[PDB]
Design an enzyme around this catalytic site. Structure first.
Site, PDB file in Angstrom:
ATOM      1  N   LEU A 112       3.451 -15.104  -9.200  1.00 58.12           N
ATOM      2  CA  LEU A 112       2.200 -15.225 -10.028  1.00 58.12           C
ATOM      3  C   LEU A 112       1.149 -15.413  -8.483  1.00 58.12           C
ATOM      4  O   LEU A 112       0.147 -16.205  -8.769  1.00 58.12           O
ATOM      5  CB  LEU A 112       2.040 -16.427 -10.601  1.00 58.12           C
ATOM      6  CG  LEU A 112       3.225 -16.380 -11.835  1.00 58.12           C
ATOM      7  CD1 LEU A 112       3.298 -17.661 -12.636  1.00 58.12           C
ATOM      8  CD2 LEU A 112       2.836 -15.290 -12.671  1.00 58.12           C
TER       9      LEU A 112
ATOM     10  N   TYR B 112      -1.297  -1.576   3.979  1.00 59.46           N
ATOM     11  CA  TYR B 112      -0.505  -1.208   2.853  1.00 59.46           C
ATOM     12  C   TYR B 112       0.299  -0.004   2.720  1.00 59.46           C
ATOM     13  O   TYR B 112       1.254  -0.105   2.120  1.00 59.46           O
ATOM     14  CB  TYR B 112      -1.452  -1.449   1.612  1.00 59.46           C
ATOM     15  CG  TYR B 112      -1.210  -0.931   0.273  1.00 59.46           C
ATOM     16  CD1 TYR B 112      -1.680   0.250  -0.298  1.00 59.46           C
ATOM     17  CD2 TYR B 112      -0.348  -1.694  -0.475  1.00 59.46           C
ATOM     18  CE1 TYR B 112      -1.436   0.785  -1.677  1.00 59.46           C
ATOM     19  CE2 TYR B 112      -0.126  -1.379  -1.601  1.00 59.46           C
ATOM     20  CZ  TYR B 112      -0.627  -0.170  -2.148  1.00 59.46           C
ATOM     21  OH  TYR B 112      -0.427   0.398  -3.512  1.00 59.46           O
TER      22      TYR B 112
ATOM     23  N   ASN C 149      -4.465   6.707  -8.603  1.00 62.30           N
ATOM     24  CA  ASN C 149      -5.225   5.748  -8.898  1.00 62.30           C
ATOM     25  C   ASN C 149      -5.109   4.975 -10.381  1.00 62.30           C
ATOM     26  O   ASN C 149      -5.790   5.613 -11.210  1.00 62.30           O
ATOM     27  CB  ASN C 149      -6.802   5.839  -8.762  1.00 62.30           C
ATOM     28  CG  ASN C 149      -7.293   5.653  -7.349  1.00 62.30           C
ATOM     29  OD1 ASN C 149      -6.459   5.432  -6.380  1.00 62.30           O
ATOM     30  ND2 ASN C 149      -8.673   5.148  -7.364  1.00 62.30           N
TER      31      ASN C 149
END
Ligand SMILES: NC(=O)c1ccc[n+]([C@@H]2O[C@H](COP(=O)([O-])OP(=O)(O)OC[C@H]3O[C@@H](n4cnc5c(N)ncnc54)[C@H](O)[C@@H]3O)[C@@H](O)[C@H]2O)c1
Ligand SMILES: NC(=O)c1ccc[n+]([C@@H]2O[C@H](COP(=O)([O-])OP(=O)(O)OC[C@H]3O[C@@H](n4cnc5c(N)ncnc54)[C@H](O)[C@@H]3O)[C@@H](O)[C@H]2O)c1
Lengths: 308, 308
Positions: free
Chosen positions: A33, A143, A172
């Site tokens: 989370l 990333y 995307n």
């Protein structure tokens, strides 16, 4: 059959969980989370609020439930955060992936389906558009480097142990439940601001081109990868390029917004153009996108309206 | 006296780099967790922190206090076999550790970061061109090779993002005084120690595996040349000459006066068949070439093991 979905409290992950539950699978979700939301969780799935980097906890979860498939969506998926905190990004994106892979081998997972990136992986000097999987990756952000690294580790686990995998390099991805920070975060940023009548910012000249793929289509690619595409990497995108200026225009007409964008200085690391060739997925997975950008944006705007 | 940080400075190659820097008048700080390094390798004139490069809080203190102008990054998990058995642990040292150092290097104004990488584990198993140039597309097949290549990509990110200058040195099979038996040229220490003790020596498979054996003193010279030259470049550091394991056995047998035949064992999984590095680029841009022939280097190595 038990299936593990990491990142199942997140945007794409929660849609994958929903679809698996619908189709009658037993689903176990692992999510810390950090960016996912309790509201996204499916009440029918078993949920562990834990980190994929926690070796002892992952040992426990795999030993109890022995998943036959792992859908690995858990990631630090904001490019900007990866730039500010590369070591922390890599701990989640590379080390967390390796923990899951080590447990997958130990507990006999049949297939590992990895969410990777198309836009952040091909780099900034691509010449072939739409871009095929045969183009060598040259990622420029932490990333993208992390995702590419993990793809190489997957091939190692396949060679060394015979683990089956499929890599899905998404374009995307946008749609209901998305936050404003992921690779298509702009869709949410534009939609929420326009619905609130707030100012909208565009970076540079707005001529940056991306390939916008609707979340439902991405979910379908994940499910098709269960029984097809063993040990293959696939682009998952539409092969259609849209500039930020064009995206703004489409959302403006849908929302009824009546102000011009405010142009700001360009941000570092913004790849000029990304468009993916999905021919391979079409041929091997039987996958094609079903939702046009026009239809997807309307469904997305409708979700955010209800939120307001 | 200019401050320099050497990670892995208690290890085989790193301890020789430290000795040379101290000899040249630099102030040297060493960071090493002695996971594979030894206190007896440590130069007593260096300031030694027994710490892990992954420890962000500790690395923050070291860089903040000493503000090293150069970082020579040799700390690694450098056994290929260990990396195969424990990929997540290997990646924590090799990738995450490197990322912690790089984050601190940017924050505290390091001028140049000199990274020890690998030629043999990076080019992979299907190379056709020998001696192999840096233009060869990497295809690492071990976690160690993947981790090294991942770190190389991250180095390019830090250079682009912050202007950090770097040099990557892809070593061939490095042998010499102080080596342990586990590194990429571990075979030299294994053969030497066992021959000096008159014990059995094992050759795996047919002994026809070809490697490029480069003497440690030559590797250290490449590190020093990379201080002022070769900004933002990747260099193979090897001899351009291949030697089979059988030939290495013959050479060491002659030098040690060993009087037995080798015992053959089954082949190792994942042993690349041939690695020979082209050092033309380093010769041109660093002005580097090997000064120690294999015959000479093996003799010096045998001398060290006798004393020791
Ligand atoms: N959104 C896009 O456009 C896009 C494009 C290409 C690839 N992807 C990839 O798809 C996957 C899902 O992306 P998303 O858009 O849904 O982002 P998301 O942030 O909404 O989903 C990621 C989930 O992983 C969880 N998580 C993060 N670190 C964790 C950890 N250490 N342990 C357990 N859980 C952790 C987060 O809480 C979150 O719920 C990611 O792998 C992402 O890289 C997304
Ligand atoms: N043939 C070779 O030896 C060879 C070939 C190619 C590349 N290299 C590279 O050269 C470098 C040195 O290799 P080496 O042969 O001298 O190995 P080495 O094991 O003797 O040296 C590595 C040192 O790093 C230290 N270390 C490991 N993890 C650490 C951590 N988390 N924090 C701090 N210190 C840590 C070890 O204690 C050790 O002293 C490595 O980067 C290695 O990958 C070596």
């Amino acid at each position: 059959m038990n299936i593990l979905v990491t990142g199942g409290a997140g945007f794409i992950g929660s849609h994958v969980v929903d679809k698996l539950i619908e189709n009658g699978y037993g689903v176990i979700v692992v999510d810390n989370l950090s960016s996912g939301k309790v509201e996204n969780l499916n009440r029918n799935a078993l949920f562990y609020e834990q980190s994929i980097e926690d070796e002892e906890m992952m040992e426990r979860i795999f030993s109890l439930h022995r998943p036959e498939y792992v859908f690995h969506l858990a990631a630090q998926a904001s490019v900007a955060i990866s730039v500010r905190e590369p070591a922390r990004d890599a701990k989640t994106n590379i080390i967390g992936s390796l923990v899951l892979l080590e447990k997958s081998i130990k507990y006999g997972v049949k297939k590992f389906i990895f969410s990777s990136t198309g836009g952040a992986i091909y780099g900034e000097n691509v010449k072939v558009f739409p871009t095929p999987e045969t183009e060598i990756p040259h990622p420029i952000s932490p990333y993208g480097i992390a995702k590419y690294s993990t793809e190489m580790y997957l091939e190692f686990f396949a060679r060394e142990y015979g683990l089956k995998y499929t890599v899905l390099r998404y374009a995307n991805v946008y749609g209901p439940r998305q936050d404003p920070y992921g690779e298509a975060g702009v869709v949410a940023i534009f939609t929420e601001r326009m619905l609130r009548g707030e100012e909208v910012h565009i970076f540079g000249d707005g001529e940056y081109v991306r390939d916008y793929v609707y979340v439902d289509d991405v979910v379908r690619a994940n499910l098709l990868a269960m029984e097809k595409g063993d040990n293959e990497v696939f682009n998952i995108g539409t092969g259609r390029g849209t500039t930020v200026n064009q995206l703004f225009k489409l959302l403006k007409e849908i929302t009824g917004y009546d102000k011009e964008p405010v142009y700001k200085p360009p941000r570092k690391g913004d790849v000029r153009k990304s468009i993916l060739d999905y021919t391979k997925a079409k041929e091997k997975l039987g996958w094609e996108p079903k939702v046009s950008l026009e239809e997807g944006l309307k469904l997305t705007v409708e979700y955010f309206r209800k939120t307001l």
